[PDB]
Amino acid sequence: GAMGSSEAEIKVREATSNDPWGPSSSLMSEIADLTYNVVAFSEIMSMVWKRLNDHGKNWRHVYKAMTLMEYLIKTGSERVAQQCRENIYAVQTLKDFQYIDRDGKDQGVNVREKAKQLVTLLKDEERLREERIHALKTKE
Numbered sequence: 001g002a003m004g005s006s007e008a009e010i011k012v013r014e015a016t017s018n019d020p021w022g023p024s025s026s027l028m029s030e031i032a033d034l035t036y037n038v039v040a041f042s043e044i045m046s047m048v049w050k051r052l053n054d055h056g057k058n059w060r061h062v063y064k065a066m067t068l069m070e071y072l073i074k075t076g077s078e079r080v081a082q083q084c085r086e087n088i089y090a091v092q093t094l095k096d097f098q099y100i101d102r103d104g105k106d107q108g109v110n111v112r113e114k115a116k117q118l119v120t121l122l123k124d125e126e127r128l129r130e131e132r133i134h135a136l137k138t139k140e
Contacts, residue, residue, distance in 0.1 A: 009043045
């Protein structure tokens, strides 16, 4: 289903699901390779920004989308980091993300801290170069 049709959006959804495991490194590597495919890049990034804009009980979409975005910034096409810097507000807003679950536990704190770290990385082009060498070595 069918004829080698794109599964880019589906792979991103899988990588950013509410499941309390993942995202898987092999799946993330597949998505990173697809970011060099201009058609797939658009599908991937749109889905990641959507997951980064979920809330509440879907907080893990946001947390896992940041893990995926970080991996793609470091391991994928340099167009990823460029688009993220262009859309930096969509990451910065997450430093304000709130969610208290029904057990009273602050899941939002994980989102806010991950966002803080991703923003400092994106603002530093030297850090991005260093991180890319290390990340590409992990990939290969």
